[PDB]
Amino acid sequence: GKLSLQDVAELIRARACQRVVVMVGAGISTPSGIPDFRSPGSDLPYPEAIFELPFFFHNPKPFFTLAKELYPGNYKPNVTHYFLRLLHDKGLLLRLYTQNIDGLERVSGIPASKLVEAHGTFASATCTVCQRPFPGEDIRADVMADRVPRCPVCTGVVKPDIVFFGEPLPQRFLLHVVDFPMADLLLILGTSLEVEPFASLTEAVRSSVPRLLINRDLVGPLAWHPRSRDVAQLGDVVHGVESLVELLGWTEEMRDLVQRETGKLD
Amino acid sequence: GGAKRHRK
Ligand SMILES: [Zn+2]
């Protein structure tokens, strides 16, 4: 018959799937307290202005307040991140692609080599005028003092390396040409798949590769181009991952990891 | 089609 969440967990437990590629979005960051990027406040021509360069040049204060909130150290990873961390620790993670900019994937312990922050990061920054690169730390203070970072060379605005609309995606994104054909399982956690070219990556896997979606809604290419080995665990993203963790037998090992990695951060 | 863009 058709594949179920239990059948995919059985495939993982049997080690039939060992090249898992994961795609994640805001659905896995909202349970950690990350605010919705469309509904601010925890100045909008349209919701996407916060990540649009012309507005940013008109008024960059809204983006830099959002950053002061999302900059590392404030929020902390949740169960979904530590599940993916466990996938990596067990040698099953080929690569984790994320649309999120909170850095919680790195904080959960996933090494940068196994991670593709496809929509940029606050760890680096670039001057909007002369393109001079800068370490993300070199501008941290300015954002905490509610300032606007400025280039020490040309006085232009320095922008964290968050990929804005219209901007190219980082170069580590181009690892998708080799990873997705090499994947034997595709997990899609908490994303509406409305942003391209990220969303189109669901189709970059082979039709013999299962695609498991844990998201409140069946969204995007999985709804209009369904495949035989597609599985959809619709509902809350945390409960869906916890159901998969139980079906995998990782509940207690998770409970150990979540308590030890959290206390490490005091 | 390598540049970030929303469906709309
Ligand atoms: Zn400059």
Residue numbers in the entry:
A (entry chain A): 121 to 162, 172 to 395
B (entry chain B): 20 to 27
Would you copy out the relevant sentences from the publication that reported this structure?
Lysine lactylation (Kla) is a novel histone post-translational modification discovered in late 2019. Emerging biological and structural evidence suggests that Sirtuins are not limited to erasing acetyl groups from lysine residues but can also remove other forms of acyl groups. Our findings indicate that SIRT3 exhibits higher delactylation activity compared to other human Sirtuins, especially on H4K16 site.
In both structures, F180, I230, I291, and V292 of SIRT3 formed a preconfigured hydrophobic cage that accommodated the hydrocarbon portion of the lactyl group. Several water molecules participated in the hydrogen bond network to facilitate the interaction between the hydroxyl group of the Kla and Q228, N229, H248 of SIRT3 in SIRT3-H4K16la(L) structure. Furthermore, a water bridge network involving Q228, N229, and H248 of SIRT3 stabilizes the hydroxyl group of lactyl-lysine. The fitted curve calculated KM = 142.66 ± 2.64 μM, Vmax = 0.925 ± 0.101 μmol/L/min, kcat = 0.08 ± 0.008 s−1, kcat/KM = 5.40∗102 s−1M−1. Knocking down either SIRT3 or HDAC3 increased cellular H4K16la level. The binding affinity of SIRT3 to lactylated D-lysine peptide was also found to be approximately 2-fold higher than that of lactylated L-lysine peptide. Hence, the probe p-H4K16laAlk validated that H4K16la is the substrate of SIRT3 in cellualr environment.
